[PDB]
Amino acid sequence: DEQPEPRTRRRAYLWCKEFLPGAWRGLREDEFHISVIRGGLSNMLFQCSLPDTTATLGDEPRKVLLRLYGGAEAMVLESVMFAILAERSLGPKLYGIFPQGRLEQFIPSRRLDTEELSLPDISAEIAEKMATFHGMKMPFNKEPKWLFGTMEKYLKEVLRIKFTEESRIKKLHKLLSYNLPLELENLRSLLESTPSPVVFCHNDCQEGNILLLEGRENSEKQKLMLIDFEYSSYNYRGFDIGNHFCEWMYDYSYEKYPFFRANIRKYPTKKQQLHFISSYLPAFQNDFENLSTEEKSIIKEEMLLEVNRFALASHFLWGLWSIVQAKISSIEFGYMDYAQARFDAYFHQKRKLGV
Ligand SMILES: CN(C)c1cc[n+](Cc2ccc(CCCCc3ccc(C[n+]4ccc(N5CCCC5)cc4)cc3)cc2)cc1
Structure with a gap:
């Protein structure tokens, strides 16, 4: 205490x-x-x-x-958001x-660990909770400018960073050697051709923002709460889901530098992705199960492509964010190594997709 x-x-x-x-x-x-x-x-x-x-x-x-x-605007929006989610019994x-x-x-609870994200009952409830979040009407701007607006903002910051420490200088030169302006526009072109509804997104559905409710641990349903809505915004649905899938790969509990572990093999398999979206879809569109098996199949196949393409934007955004944190943060985390991990995964996923 x-x-x-x-x-x-x-x-x-x-x-x-x-x-x-x-x-x-x-x-x-x-x-x-x-x-x-x-x-x-x-x-x-x-x-x-x-x-x-x-x-x-x-x-x-x-x-x-x-x-x-x-600033003051950010305080108003976050406070209004939190108050509304509380009224609707979707937050504390x-x-x-x-x-x-x-x-x-x-809320008596603990946070989930990275490994627990892949448990079928956990994954199914996260999908249900995200679908519920995505149905929120909220009094905020509904233009989906957030994703590429934030990536452009971070990219401009990154290009101008002047490190003084040698390892950060070297790691930055490698990250910038990819020609990030052009890559960002290739990503923009891909996602512009990828239909994805604009919904109220959490934008940070990692294990550290998911409560396992005390006393519900052996209950099959209703044992989680999504929290920490600070980064929420109207955004493409595919980003929220793809970003969550990316978080399967990263364990932030590692007690040594760089204070995370990354494992590309822990990204959900297509079987695991189908399990998630099979819970998401009837929670987001409750007569979904009354559709034919073939129409459900088409919807699921198109969603798989949607979310795995938008997962690329999770890697790019968080990679840029992490470089910025390496410059401005006051916290001991391996930000440049994490940036490289996200860009490594970006190009790996790009290959798998064939784009
Ligand atoms: C949507 N979006 C752009 C963002 C959404 C939320 N944030 C808050 C956000 C703010 C600050 C951090 C750095 C926290 C530093 C202290 C701290 C150090 C280690 C740990 C364990 N730990 C290490 C790393 C970690 N990471 C999250 C992926 C980035 C890495 C999480 C937990 C936890 C806390 C991470 C996320 C920033 C950006």
Whole structure:
């Protein structure tokens, strides 16, 4: 039970006392319980709780999550999004919002590991949860400018990076030797000919953003929750699914430099992809199962091509993102090696597709 700084404990006490009802309003500071869940310099997480000897007065929570962020448009959109998903029972409830952070429902859980993404019941539920997410109507721009707008933005940053450390200079020269402007436009041309509906996408469906709900671990359905919606946007459906498939290949729990492992052989097989989309489609279009077997087959075959082509944009986007992080991040991760891993997978997948 790691304790926060006294000033943070004091601030958290005050946010809980003023934003939460019932027993919280009369809580004494010396009976306030708080422990650090996740540290860092940004989006620190804390668990805040009543003492076990304090009875609740009504329906107020006994335990909450405090998220501390530490532009203004980004704050408005993210806060509105989180509030809406909470109303719709698709994210944790929202108890309080303030300039420094927010108070959220505490969901007893652990995150999934990379290997668990391939378990058939897990994969089927992720597909169902993603299809549900993709049905959200949200009050945000519905033009799918996000994917290539972000890749163009990152590419312009990357081309101008001036590293001073020798290994980063050398690794950057290799990544730029591919002629990334031209490759990005070849990717744009391919995806422009690849139909994919524009839906509200999570854009980051990795194992670290999927909760395994405590006490549901042996239940066949409804044991997961997708969280961490910060990067969500209207986007091509194929990206959300392809990006999720790419995440089967990357384990971020490796405790040595470069602090990830990559395994191209862990990408879902076409059998595993069919299992996923066979759960996705009836969750996204609930009379899907009443179609003929041949019409379902066509839809599934076309989706396989769609998602594996958009998986290329997952590699390209995250590869560029990682180079940018190598320049600007304050965190110990092997960003340049991860970039090379994503571009290696980009070209490997390009070959398999024949493009
Ligand atoms: C949609 N999109 C463009 C993004 C979506 C979300 N982010 C947040 C996002 C922000 C920051 C990071 C770096 C975190 C550094 C601290 C930290 C270090 C290691 C680990 C274990 N770990 C290591 C690497 C890791 N990665 C995710 C793929 C990139 C690699 C995850 C977990 C976890 C945390 C990663 C993702 C950024 C971009």
